């Protein structure tokens, strides 16, 4: 069960450093080097960095030594990626990703950090329940006027899978993101099982559940 | 530095084969290894070495690589080979290095007629003196879709927000489509309707503020 959990996403200004964590869990964190990998919004992957478990020791991308600090936490199993004097071209998802041990590809991938550097302020989303007004019923929650992406969408705490579509996010003019998430359900539940929708924006620490029906 | 040059993109019918390259000065002489990036997910490692598989990868995925390139074979392809594919080797002196990557896209799917909902505006939403309309448009394949809103059937031009359809963990598109209102011009129609297109067929969904 090799696991690498990062932390949350985070809006930052420019001129400023964030530092994102990697938890290692489930083998020996020092039997494998830890490389971080960034993509740019619709670009390819961009390797940052390596960094010896056992040594701190690093290999940088040239491009990114001069603001790029790598770290680890022996004690914790977590490696730690600090890039500072942040521009607006830093914004991008990081990834973690463990190295082959004695070898060179990048085995196990963490599933990323949305790291967006602007001076834009951040906006915790509104959410709406969506219903009709008069074989399957649709219920919903629109996730509105949110900065910067990401948010997630869980109905019921988690419990509520089937049926279940998240869709992804319109950018508006504003600078405005909004998202909706439907759940499909028999209407012969209507009434018994209550219907919430949890949405989490880990940019402005934004946590709301919305009671749809019932 | 090093570089590793991919395709743009390829596309490949279901069932069938492709080959994605990634050409590099003496490539043959480095050992090479492949990612596949689904749509909103983290890369996976499919290749490694050229030509190994790691667990989980079926034999009709295969890798080569000889002179100066290497190369990505997808055989049988199923609909969840879609997405991005990247190239890698480890060079001793500009260390790990990347393709620009492919886009793959699998096509000669079934056809999927699209599911629409139309959402009338929240009364919570009213509250805080704005109208919007919401359109979900889901499990479609092809991807190619005309939503049209109309206000007592007369087309709008003003306040539509419409995502471009994006694949989903299902394979099939969906898009989501929004319409803002002043609260007035909400109530100042009998109906509200969300019109979609798709290969031909045109659904409708109707909303009416005297049922809210």
Same mark, same amino acid.
């Given at each position: 069960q090799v696991q690498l959990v990062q932390s949350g996403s985070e809006l930052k200004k420019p001129g400023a450093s964030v530092k994102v964590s990697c938890k290692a869990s489930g083998y020996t964190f020092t039997q494998?080097?830890?490389?971080?990998?960034?993509?740019?919004?619709?670009?390819?992957?961009?390797?940052?960095?390596?960094?010896?478990?056992?040594?701190?020791?690093?290999?940088?991308?040239?491009?990114?030594?001069?603001?790029?600090?790598?770290? &680890?936490?022996?004690?914790?199993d977590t490696a730690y990626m600090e890039l500072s004097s942040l521009r607006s071209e830093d914004t991008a998802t990081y990834h973690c990703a463990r190295r082959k041990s004695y070898g060179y590809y990048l085995d196990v991938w963490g599933e990323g950090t949305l790291v967006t550097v602007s001076s834009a302020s951040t906006k915790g989303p509104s959410v709406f329940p969506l219903a009709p007004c008069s074989s399957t019923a649709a219920l919903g929650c629109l996730v509105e006027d949110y900065?910067?992406?990401? &948010?997630?969408?869980?109905?019921?705490?988690?419990?509520?899978?089937?049926? &279940?579509?998240?869709?992804?996010?319109?950018?508006?003019?504003?600078?405005?993101?909004?998202?909706?998430?439907?759940?499909? &359900?028999?209407?012969?539940?209507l009434g018994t099982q209550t219907y919430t929708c949890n949405v989490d924006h880990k940019p402005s620490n934004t946590k709301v559940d919305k009671r749809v029906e019932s | 530095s090093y570089v590793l040059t991919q395709p743009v993109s390829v596309s490949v019918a279901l069932g069938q084969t492709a080959t994605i390259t990634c050409e590099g000065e003496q490539i043959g002489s480095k050992e090479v290894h492949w990612y596949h990036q689904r749509p909103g997910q983290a890369p996976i490692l499919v290749m490694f070495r050229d030509a190994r598989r790691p667990?989980?990868?079926?034999?009709?995925?295969?890798?080569?690589?000889?002179?100066?390139?290497?190369?990505?074979?997808?055989?049988?392809?199923?609909?969840?080979?879609?997405g991005?594919?990247?190239c890698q080797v480890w060079d001793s002196?500009?260390?790990?290095?990347?393709?620009?990557?492919?886009?793959?896209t699998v096509v000669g799917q079934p056809k999927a007629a699209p599911s629409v909902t139309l959402f009338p505006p929240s009364s919570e939403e009213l509250q805080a003196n704005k109208a919007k309309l919401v359109c979900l448009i889901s499990d479609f394949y092809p991807g190619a879709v005309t939503v049209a809103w109309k206000a007592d059937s007369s087309p709008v031009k003003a306040g539509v927000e419409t995502t471009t359809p994006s694949k989903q963990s299902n394979n099939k598109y969906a898009a989501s489509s929004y319409l803002?209102?002043?609260?007035?011009?909400?109530?100042?129609?009998?109906?509200?309707?969300?019109?979609?297109?798709?290969?031909?067929?045109?659904?409708?969904?109707?909303?009416?503020?005297?049922?809210?």
């Open positions: 494998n080097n830890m490389d971080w990998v960034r993509q740019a919004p619709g670009q390819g992957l961009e390797w940052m960095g390596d960094i010896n478990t056992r040594s701190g020791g690093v290999i940088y991308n040239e491009e990114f030594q001069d603001r790029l600090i790598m770290t &680890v936490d022996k004690s914790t900065f910067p992406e990401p &948010v997630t969408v869980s109905w019921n705490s988690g419990a509520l899978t089937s049926g &279940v579509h998240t869709f992804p996010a319109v950018l508006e003019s504003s600078g405005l993101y909004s998202l909706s998430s439907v759940v499909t &359900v028999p209407s012969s539940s | 667990s989980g990868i079926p034999e009709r995925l295969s890798g080569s690589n000889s002179g100066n390139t290497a190369s990505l074979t997808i055989s049988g392809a199923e609909a969840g080979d879609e991005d594919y990247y002196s500009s260390y790990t290095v990347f393709g620009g990557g492919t886009k793959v803002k209102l002043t609260p007035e011009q909400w109530k100042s129609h009998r109906s509200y309707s969300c019109q979609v297109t798709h290969e031909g067929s045109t659904v409708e969904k109707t909303v009416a503020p005297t049922e809210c």
